[PDB]
Short mmCIF file of C-alpha atoms in Angstrom, two decimals:
data_model
loop_
_atom_site.label_atom_id
_atom_site.label_comp_id
_atom_site.label_asym_id
_atom_site.label_seq_id
_atom_site.Cartn_x
_atom_site.Cartn_y
_atom_site.Cartn_z
CA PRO A 1 -2.13 -105.65 77.75
CA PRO A 2 -4.20 -105.63 80.03
CA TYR A 3 -6.88 -107.58 77.73
CA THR A 4 -11.26 -107.31 78.36
CA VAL A 5 -13.22 -108.84 76.47
CA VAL A 6 -17.15 -107.42 75.97
CA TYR A 7 -19.12 -110.34 74.74
CA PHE A 8 -21.82 -112.14 76.05
CA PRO A 9 -22.04 -115.22 78.46
CA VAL A 10 -21.39 -117.77 76.02
CA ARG A 11 -18.58 -119.59 74.11
CA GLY A 12 -19.00 -118.56 71.31
CA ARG A 13 -16.72 -116.39 69.01
CA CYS A 14 -14.51 -115.72 72.03
CA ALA A 15 -13.82 -119.18 72.50
CA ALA A 16 -10.61 -119.28 70.23
CA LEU A 17 -9.16 -116.25 71.56
CA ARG A 18 -10.21 -116.16 75.35
CA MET A 19 -7.83 -120.57 74.36
CA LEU A 20 -5.34 -118.18 73.09
CA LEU A 21 -5.09 -115.38 75.88
CA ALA A 22 -5.00 -118.42 78.48
CA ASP A 23 -2.23 -120.98 76.61
CA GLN A 24 -0.06 -118.09 75.61
CA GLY A 25 0.32 -117.27 79.74
CA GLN A 26 -2.29 -114.42 79.52
CA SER A 27 -4.18 -113.11 82.14
CA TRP A 28 -7.37 -111.35 81.04
CA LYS A 29 -11.31 -109.62 82.61
CA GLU A 30 -14.20 -110.95 81.51
CA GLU A 31 -17.27 -108.73 81.36
CA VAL A 32 -20.72 -110.20 81.26
CA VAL A 33 -23.77 -109.02 78.66
CA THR A 34 -26.83 -109.90 79.95
CA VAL A 35 -29.63 -110.72 76.69
CA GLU A 36 -30.95 -108.48 78.91
CA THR A 37 -28.42 -106.02 79.08
CA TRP A 38 -28.07 -105.99 75.63
CA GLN A 39 -32.01 -104.87 74.68
CA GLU A 40 -31.48 -101.41 77.20
CA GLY A 41 -29.70 -100.67 73.21
CA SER A 42 -26.91 -98.71 74.96
CA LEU A 43 -23.71 -100.61 74.22
CA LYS A 44 -24.96 -101.99 71.41
CA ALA A 45 -24.84 -98.92 69.40
CA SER A 46 -21.33 -98.24 71.42
CA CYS A 47 -20.81 -100.79 68.72
CA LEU A 48 -19.20 -100.13 65.60
CA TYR A 49 -20.66 -102.75 63.70
CA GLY A 50 -23.59 -102.90 66.26
CA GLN A 51 -22.21 -106.94 67.27
CA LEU A 52 -19.62 -108.03 69.93
CA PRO A 53 -17.27 -109.15 70.98
CA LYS A 54 -15.83 -106.16 71.46
CA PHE A 55 -11.52 -105.98 73.18
CA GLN A 56 -9.83 -103.97 74.93
CA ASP A 57 -6.35 -104.43 74.73
CA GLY A 58 -4.44 -101.40 76.98
CA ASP A 59 -5.89 -97.99 75.10
CA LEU A 60 -6.87 -99.96 71.31
CA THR A 61 -11.09 -101.21 71.56
CA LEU A 62 -11.32 -103.87 69.34
CA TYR A 63 -14.24 -105.67 67.26
CA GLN A 64 -14.33 -108.38 65.30
CA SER A 65 -13.83 -112.28 66.96
CA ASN A 66 -11.15 -111.97 63.45
CA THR A 67 -9.43 -108.76 64.33
CA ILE A 68 -9.10 -109.48 67.14
CA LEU A 69 -7.17 -112.62 67.00
CA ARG A 70 -5.15 -110.94 64.58
CA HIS A 71 -4.33 -108.62 66.51
CA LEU A 72 -3.68 -111.06 68.92
CA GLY A 73 -1.19 -113.03 66.87
CA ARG A 74 0.95 -109.77 65.62
CA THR A 75 1.48 -108.28 68.76
CA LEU A 76 1.66 -112.20 70.61
CA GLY A 77 4.39 -113.20 67.90
CA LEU A 78 1.47 -115.93 67.04
CA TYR A 79 1.44 -114.48 62.91
CA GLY A 80 3.70 -117.43 61.19
CA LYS A 81 7.94 -117.13 61.15
CA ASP A 82 8.10 -115.63 57.95
CA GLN A 83 5.44 -114.26 54.88
CA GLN A 84 4.90 -117.42 54.16
CA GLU A 85 4.13 -119.15 56.78
CA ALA A 86 1.94 -115.36 57.78
CA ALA A 87 0.15 -116.23 54.46
CA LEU A 88 -1.16 -119.88 54.56
CA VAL A 89 -2.04 -118.83 58.91
CA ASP A 90 -4.64 -116.72 56.94
CA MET A 91 -5.73 -119.48 54.30
CA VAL A 92 -6.51 -121.40 57.50
CA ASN A 93 -8.18 -118.81 59.98
CA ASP A 94 -9.83 -118.36 56.29
CA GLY A 95 -10.91 -121.31 56.12
CA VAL A 96 -12.44 -122.24 59.34
CA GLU A 97 -14.75 -118.58 59.53
CA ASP A 98 -16.52 -119.80 56.30
CA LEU A 99 -17.20 -123.06 58.17
CA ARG A 100 -18.16 -121.09 61.63
CA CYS A 101 -20.28 -118.80 59.63
CA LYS A 102 -22.35 -122.08 58.27
CA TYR A 103 -21.88 -124.32 61.68
CA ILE A 104 -23.66 -120.47 62.74
CA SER A 105 -26.12 -119.94 60.44
CA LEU A 106 -27.14 -124.14 61.40
CA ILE A 107 -27.47 -123.19 64.72
CA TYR A 108 -29.23 -120.06 64.41
CA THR A 109 -31.08 -120.31 61.17
CA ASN A 110 -32.48 -124.23 61.36
CA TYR A 111 -31.21 -126.44 63.78
CA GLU A 112 -33.80 -129.10 62.90
CA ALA A 113 -34.37 -129.05 59.58
CA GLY A 114 -31.04 -129.09 57.93
CA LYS A 115 -28.97 -131.00 61.00
CA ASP A 116 -28.44 -133.99 58.81
CA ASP A 117 -27.04 -132.25 55.98
CA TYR A 118 -24.59 -130.18 57.80
CA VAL A 119 -23.27 -133.51 59.31
CA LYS A 120 -23.66 -134.88 55.91
CA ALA A 121 -21.68 -132.01 54.38
CA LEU A 122 -19.13 -131.92 57.42
CA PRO A 123 -16.60 -134.68 55.69
CA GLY A 124 -16.18 -133.02 52.58
CA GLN A 125 -16.19 -129.29 55.14
CA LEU A 126 -13.00 -130.73 57.53
CA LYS A 127 -11.09 -132.93 54.83
CA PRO A 128 -9.89 -130.06 53.83
CA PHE A 129 -7.86 -128.79 57.52
CA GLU A 130 -7.14 -132.60 57.67
CA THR A 131 -5.05 -132.34 54.25
CA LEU A 132 -3.13 -129.00 54.99
CA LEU A 133 -2.77 -130.93 58.67
CA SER A 134 -0.56 -132.92 56.27
CA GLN A 135 1.44 -131.54 54.38
CA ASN A 136 3.45 -129.98 57.83
CA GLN A 137 5.89 -132.31 58.62
CA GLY A 138 3.04 -135.22 58.52
CA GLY A 139 1.10 -132.81 60.82
CA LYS A 140 2.89 -134.49 63.86
CA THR A 141 3.35 -131.08 65.29
CA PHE A 142 0.60 -127.24 63.68
CA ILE A 143 0.03 -127.10 60.88
CA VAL A 144 1.70 -124.15 59.45
CA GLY A 145 5.12 -124.21 60.33
CA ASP A 146 6.39 -125.48 64.13
CA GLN A 147 5.09 -122.99 66.69
CA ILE A 148 1.85 -122.33 67.22
CA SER A 149 -0.53 -119.25 66.14
CA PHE A 150 -3.77 -117.77 66.47
CA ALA A 151 -5.67 -119.72 63.80
CA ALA A 152 -4.48 -122.84 65.54
CA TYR A 153 -6.89 -121.77 68.23
CA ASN A 154 -10.13 -120.97 66.31
CA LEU A 155 -9.16 -124.44 63.99
CA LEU A 156 -8.84 -125.97 67.23
CA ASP A 157 -12.41 -124.37 68.51
CA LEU A 158 -13.75 -125.44 65.34
CA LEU A 159 -12.92 -128.66 65.60
CA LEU A 160 -14.53 -129.09 69.52
CA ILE A 161 -17.59 -127.54 68.46
CA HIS A 162 -18.23 -129.84 65.71
CA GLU A 163 -17.24 -133.52 67.98
CA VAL A 164 -20.21 -132.07 70.11
CA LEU A 165 -22.37 -131.37 67.04
CA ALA A 166 -21.63 -134.19 65.75
CA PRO A 167 -20.03 -136.91 68.17
CA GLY A 168 -16.70 -138.71 65.94
CA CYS A 169 -17.55 -137.08 62.76
CA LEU A 170 -13.37 -136.74 63.67
CA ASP A 171 -12.64 -140.20 63.17
CA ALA A 172 -12.11 -140.60 59.78
CA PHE A 173 -9.67 -137.93 59.84
CA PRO A 174 -6.75 -138.95 61.88
CA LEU A 175 -4.63 -135.61 61.43
CA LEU A 176 -7.15 -133.60 63.12
CA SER A 177 -8.26 -136.04 65.99
CA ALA A 178 -4.55 -135.80 67.11
CA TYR A 179 -4.19 -132.41 66.46
CA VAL A 180 -7.28 -131.62 68.94
CA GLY A 181 -5.45 -133.92 71.58
CA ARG A 182 -1.99 -132.37 70.77
CA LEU A 183 -3.11 -128.99 71.97
CA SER A 184 -5.91 -129.88 74.07
CA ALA A 185 -2.68 -131.47 76.37
CA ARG A 186 -0.89 -128.06 76.39
CA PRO A 187 -0.52 -127.32 79.98
CA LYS A 188 -1.59 -123.75 80.47
CA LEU A 189 -4.13 -124.52 77.50
CA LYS A 190 -6.01 -127.82 79.21
CA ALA A 191 -6.32 -126.16 82.72
CA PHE A 192 -8.16 -122.91 81.04
CA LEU A 193 -10.43 -125.45 79.36
CA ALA A 194 -11.36 -127.69 82.44
CA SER A 195 -12.71 -124.02 84.23
CA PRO A 196 -15.24 -123.57 85.48
CA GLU A 197 -14.82 -120.52 83.56
CA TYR A 198 -15.49 -122.01 80.40
CA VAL A 199 -17.05 -125.80 81.25
CA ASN A 200 -20.07 -123.61 82.48
CA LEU A 201 -20.13 -121.63 79.37
CA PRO A 202 -23.27 -122.15 76.52
CA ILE A 203 -21.30 -123.22 73.59
CA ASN A 204 -24.11 -120.24 71.85
CA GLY A 205 -26.17 -118.29 72.80
CA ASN A 206 -30.16 -120.42 71.77
CA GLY A 207 -28.47 -123.24 73.60
CA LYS A 208 -27.77 -125.31 71.13
CA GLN A 209 -24.81 -127.30 70.47
CA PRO B 1 5.84 -111.07 41.54
CA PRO B 2 4.86 -112.05 38.67
CA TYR B 3 0.86 -112.22 39.22
CA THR B 4 -1.64 -114.40 37.96
CA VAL B 5 -4.95 -114.18 38.96
CA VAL B 6 -7.41 -117.97 38.72
CA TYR B 7 -10.71 -116.75 38.19
CA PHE B 8 -14.22 -116.99 36.84
CA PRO B 9 -15.49 -113.95 33.82
CA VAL B 10 -16.56 -112.07 36.21
CA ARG B 11 -15.46 -108.97 38.73
CA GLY B 12 -16.84 -110.94 42.27
CA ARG B 13 -14.71 -111.69 45.05
CA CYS B 14 -11.53 -110.63 42.47
CA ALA B 15 -12.44 -106.59 41.72
CA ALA B 16 -10.67 -105.25 45.06
CA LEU B 17 -7.70 -107.58 44.27
CA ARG B 18 -7.71 -106.52 40.92
CA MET B 19 -7.73 -102.72 41.87
CA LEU B 20 -5.05 -103.36 44.37
CA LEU B 21 -2.66 -104.45 41.59
CA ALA B 22 -3.53 -101.44 39.45
CA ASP B 23 -3.93 -98.74 41.30
CA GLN B 24 -0.12 -99.66 43.19
CA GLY B 25 1.10 -99.94 39.44
CA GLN B 26 1.75 -103.51 38.95
CA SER B 27 0.76 -105.61 36.24
CA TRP B 28 -0.70 -109.44 36.31
CA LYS B 29 -1.56 -112.18 34.45
CA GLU B 30 -5.62 -113.14 34.40
CA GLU B 31 -6.31 -117.45 33.43
CA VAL B 32 -9.99 -117.39 32.90
CA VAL B 33 -11.70 -120.53 33.78
CA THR B 34 -14.57 -120.97 32.26
CA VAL B 35 -18.10 -122.28 33.94
CA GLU B 36 -16.80 -125.60 30.86
CA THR B 37 -13.51 -125.59 32.61
CA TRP B 38 -14.88 -125.24 36.78
CA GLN B 39 -17.38 -128.48 35.75
CA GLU B 40 -14.49 -130.76 34.00
CA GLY B 41 -13.60 -131.65 37.38
CA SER B 42 -9.90 -131.45 37.63
CA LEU B 43 -9.68 -127.48 38.77
CA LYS B 44 -11.94 -127.31 41.55
CA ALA B 45 -10.21 -130.87 43.40
CA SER B 46 -6.76 -128.77 43.60
CA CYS B 47 -8.27 -125.67 45.54
CA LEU B 48 -7.99 -125.41 48.51
CA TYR B 49 -11.33 -125.15 49.72
CA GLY B 50 -12.58 -126.26 46.55
CA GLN B 51 -13.94 -122.33 44.84
CA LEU B 52 -11.69 -119.69 43.64
CA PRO B 53 -10.12 -116.94 43.30
CA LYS B 54 -6.47 -119.38 43.35
CA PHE B 55 -3.33 -116.78 43.39
CA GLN B 56 -0.26 -117.03 42.25
CA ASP B 57 2.46 -114.88 43.35
CA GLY B 58 5.96 -115.72 41.88
CA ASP B 59 6.30 -119.40 43.91
CA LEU B 60 3.64 -118.84 46.19
CA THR B 61 0.16 -119.87 45.81
CA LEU B 62 -3.00 -118.55 47.41
CA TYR B 63 -6.32 -119.28 47.83
CA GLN B 64 -9.54 -116.85 49.88
CA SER B 65 -9.83 -113.64 47.98
CA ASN B 66 -9.11 -111.61 51.87
CA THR B 67 -5.58 -114.09 52.22
CA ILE B 68 -4.32 -112.49 48.82
CA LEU B 69 -5.61 -108.77 49.91
CA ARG B 70 -3.81 -109.25 53.27
CA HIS B 71 -0.42 -111.11 51.87
CA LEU B 72 -0.30 -108.22 49.49
CA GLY B 73 -1.18 -106.06 51.47
CA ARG B 74 1.88 -107.04 53.96
CA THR B 75 4.24 -107.79 50.59
CA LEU B 76 3.20 -103.97 48.93
CA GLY B 77 3.25 -102.21 52.25
CA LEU B 78 -0.57 -101.70 52.66
CA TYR B 79 -1.38 -102.57 56.13
CA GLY B 80 -1.41 -99.40 57.99
CA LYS B 81 2.20 -98.31 59.90
CA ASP B 82 1.72 -99.42 63.20
CA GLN B 83 -0.27 -102.03 65.41
CA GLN B 84 -3.26 -99.63 65.97
CA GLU B 85 -3.48 -98.82 61.65
CA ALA B 86 -3.17 -102.87 61.33
CA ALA B 87 -6.11 -103.51 63.84
CA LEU B 88 -8.09 -101.05 62.65
CA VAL B 89 -7.35 -102.04 58.60
CA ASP B 90 -8.70 -105.87 59.63
CA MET B 91 -11.18 -103.93 61.10
CA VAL B 92 -12.46 -102.32 58.06
CA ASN B 93 -11.84 -105.59 56.03
CA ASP B 94 -14.28 -107.78 58.63
CA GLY B 95 -16.61 -105.18 57.77
CA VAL B 96 -16.29 -105.53 54.28
CA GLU B 97 -16.99 -109.50 54.14
CA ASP B 98 -19.85 -109.93 56.45
CA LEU B 99 -22.15 -107.15 54.17
CA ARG B 100 -19.81 -109.60 50.81
CA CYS B 101 -21.68 -112.21 52.45
CA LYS B 102 -24.91 -110.99 52.61
CA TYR B 103 -24.95 -109.09 49.45
CA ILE B 104 -23.31 -112.57 48.19
CA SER B 105 -26.53 -114.69 49.39
CA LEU B 106 -28.50 -112.36 47.94
CA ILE B 107 -27.48 -112.56 44.13
CA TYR B 108 -27.54 -115.91 44.66
CA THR B 109 -30.48 -117.33 46.95
CA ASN B 110 -33.28 -115.04 46.21
CA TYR B 111 -32.82 -111.69 45.00
CA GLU B 112 -36.44 -110.76 44.06
CA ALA B 113 -37.39 -112.09 47.27
CA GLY B 114 -35.45 -110.07 49.41
CA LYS B 115 -34.61 -106.95 47.55
CA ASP B 116 -36.63 -105.02 49.29
CA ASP B 117 -35.30 -105.45 52.55
CA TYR B 118 -32.04 -105.40 52.12
CA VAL B 119 -32.05 -102.07 50.87
CA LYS B 120 -34.09 -101.76 53.68
CA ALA B 121 -31.25 -102.83 55.84
CA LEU B 122 -28.45 -100.80 54.01
CA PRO B 123 -28.61 -97.38 55.38
CA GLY B 124 -27.78 -99.59 58.68
CA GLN B 125 -25.08 -101.37 57.30
CA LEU B 126 -22.67 -98.67 55.95
CA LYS B 127 -23.27 -96.58 58.59
CA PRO B 128 -20.05 -97.80 60.64
CA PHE B 129 -18.04 -96.92 57.50
CA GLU B 130 -19.46 -94.00 57.91
CA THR B 131 -18.13 -93.25 61.09
CA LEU B 132 -15.19 -95.38 61.08
CA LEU B 133 -14.30 -92.37 58.35
CA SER B 134 -15.44 -89.49 60.59
CA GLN B 135 -13.18 -90.41 63.22
CA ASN B 136 -9.74 -89.95 61.02
CA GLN B 137 -8.41 -86.57 60.15
CA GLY B 138 -12.78 -86.08 59.44
CA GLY B 139 -12.95 -88.41 56.70
CA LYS B 140 -10.93 -85.73 54.20
CA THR B 141 -7.96 -88.43 53.79
CA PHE B 142 -7.85 -92.24 54.07
CA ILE B 143 -9.78 -94.62 55.96
CA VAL B 144 -6.71 -95.26 58.18
CA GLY B 145 -3.74 -93.13 59.08
CA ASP B 146 -2.95 -91.42 55.53
CA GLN B 147 -1.62 -94.34 53.94
CA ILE B 148 -4.36 -96.34 51.27
CA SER B 149 -4.37 -100.58 52.99
CA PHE B 150 -5.44 -103.12 51.79
CA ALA B 151 -9.10 -102.77 52.96
CA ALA B 152 -10.07 -99.49 51.15
CA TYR B 153 -9.76 -101.23 47.95
CA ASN B 154 -12.56 -103.47 49.12
CA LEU B 155 -14.07 -101.69 50.63
CA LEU B 156 -14.74 -99.15 47.44
CA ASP B 157 -15.76 -101.85 45.95
CA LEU B 158 -18.19 -102.92 48.07
CA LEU B 159 -19.35 -99.61 47.53
CA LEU B 160 -19.48 -99.71 44.40
CA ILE B 161 -21.60 -102.43 43.43
CA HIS B 162 -23.57 -101.68 46.10
CA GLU B 163 -24.08 -98.50 44.44
CA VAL B 164 -25.04 -100.68 40.97
CA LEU B 165 -27.83 -102.88 42.76
CA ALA B 166 -29.23 -98.98 45.39
CA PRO B 167 -28.37 -96.70 42.94
CA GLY B 168 -28.09 -93.18 45.40
CA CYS B 169 -27.95 -95.44 49.11
CA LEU B 170 -24.73 -93.26 48.74
CA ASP B 171 -26.53 -90.22 49.55
CA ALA B 172 -27.09 -90.75 53.20
CA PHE B 173 -23.47 -91.08 53.50
CA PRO B 174 -21.39 -88.07 52.82
CA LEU B 175 -18.39 -89.42 53.72
CA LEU B 176 -18.63 -92.36 51.86
CA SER B 177 -19.41 -90.27 48.49
CA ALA B 178 -17.07 -88.30 48.60
CA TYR B 179 -14.37 -91.86 49.67
CA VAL B 180 -15.39 -93.43 46.48
CA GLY B 181 -14.83 -90.07 45.12
CA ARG B 182 -11.51 -89.46 45.85
CA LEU B 183 -10.17 -92.77 45.23
CA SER B 184 -11.54 -93.49 41.98
CA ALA B 185 -9.60 -90.54 41.20
CA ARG B 186 -6.25 -92.03 42.00
CA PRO B 187 -5.09 -91.87 38.90
CA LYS B 188 -3.94 -95.72 37.96
CA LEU B 189 -7.16 -96.87 38.79
CA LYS B 190 -9.23 -94.74 37.35
CA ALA B 191 -7.27 -96.46 34.36
CA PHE B 192 -8.49 -99.62 35.04
CA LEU B 193 -11.89 -98.59 36.10
CA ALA B 194 -12.25 -97.51 32.59
CA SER B 195 -10.72 -99.94 30.74
CA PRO B 196 -12.42 -102.87 28.18
CA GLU B 197 -10.37 -105.68 31.00
CA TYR B 198 -13.10 -104.29 33.80
CA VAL B 199 -15.87 -102.50 31.75
CA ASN B 200 -16.84 -105.56 30.23
CA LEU B 201 -17.39 -107.94 33.12
CA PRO B 202 -19.84 -108.54 34.76
CA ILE B 203 -20.31 -108.07 38.50
CA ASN B 204 -21.89 -111.56 39.17
CA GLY B 205 -22.19 -114.86 37.83
CA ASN B 206 -25.84 -114.97 37.11
CA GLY B 207 -26.55 -112.10 35.59
CA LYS B 208 -28.18 -110.48 38.74
CA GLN B 209 -26.50 -107.01 39.99
#
């Protein structure tokens, strides 16, 4: 700390990491990059893989949403209690990333043409998480162990946006539904999710959700 | 330990972790899965996300090539010496994963139609790693700090398969070239890359490279 997240004025790949910071009672600054400011190309080139989010933590400058989540989990202790929980946290995050990629591909590559196929395939994509949740203390707590991980925030966000995409896509998944309710109920997080900072923010950049 | 990798008879997403194990003087079991077995169905259904590789390490069963790389990096000490190195390691591995996905998309989605555009865009995709390499002791030692990390094997593989795809794509990147040369020269690794076990394996599964 202190933290600074450099991103576009959307939730996108910063949603999860912001929920993590909020829930852990951390403060951060928001440097917004207008589409126009991105178009000048000066920042762009300063970025490692020519992309955002860019994240500053004290003297550390990070790139890649997943690198920021692992850094945060590693420094804030949200990476499992042992090597086993640590490996399952990753396993869950890799799963989240894979589906987020398909989601992003839909939104930006062909929302209209393939939205139905995507939703028809959604159930089989969500099941793995439902299954992981059942193998951990009956899914009453978290997905890995008894303490929250950075992957929990990423998965939470993943689930939130697919609710907007396919309302009720979670009905056939009671464990994941209860999960979303449990985590969203967390005081600090609930307050962030209910804030203008979040609510007035569009899920994606192209205005599709 | 002991380690067992469950995968298709190809290099694909197991090439990097296999070079890691070998270079680290580790031995492993190879349980090959044929298309005929995968078709049978049962193995697929027992995989977390319906995919391979599947990795066994002692009593731990893992899925997701990157989860396995991180587990190995975490257990074998191949994840940097501190917090900074650890974040830069993830940062490097996230970038390799990003290009590896584009590469996989090409090979399996439209090799013929988009190969030229891909190779035209390649230079810009490789530059970020060239830059990272130049910022650590002049690109003379390891990519991060001064010890090997799991990301190095994954990046090495990524660079190797793009040499086959576009021979000489590294000529414009003298740092990455020397990198490949440096790591490939490592005794245990060199021995593995030069073995039948590796040589007789096709990079991909659809006969394209």
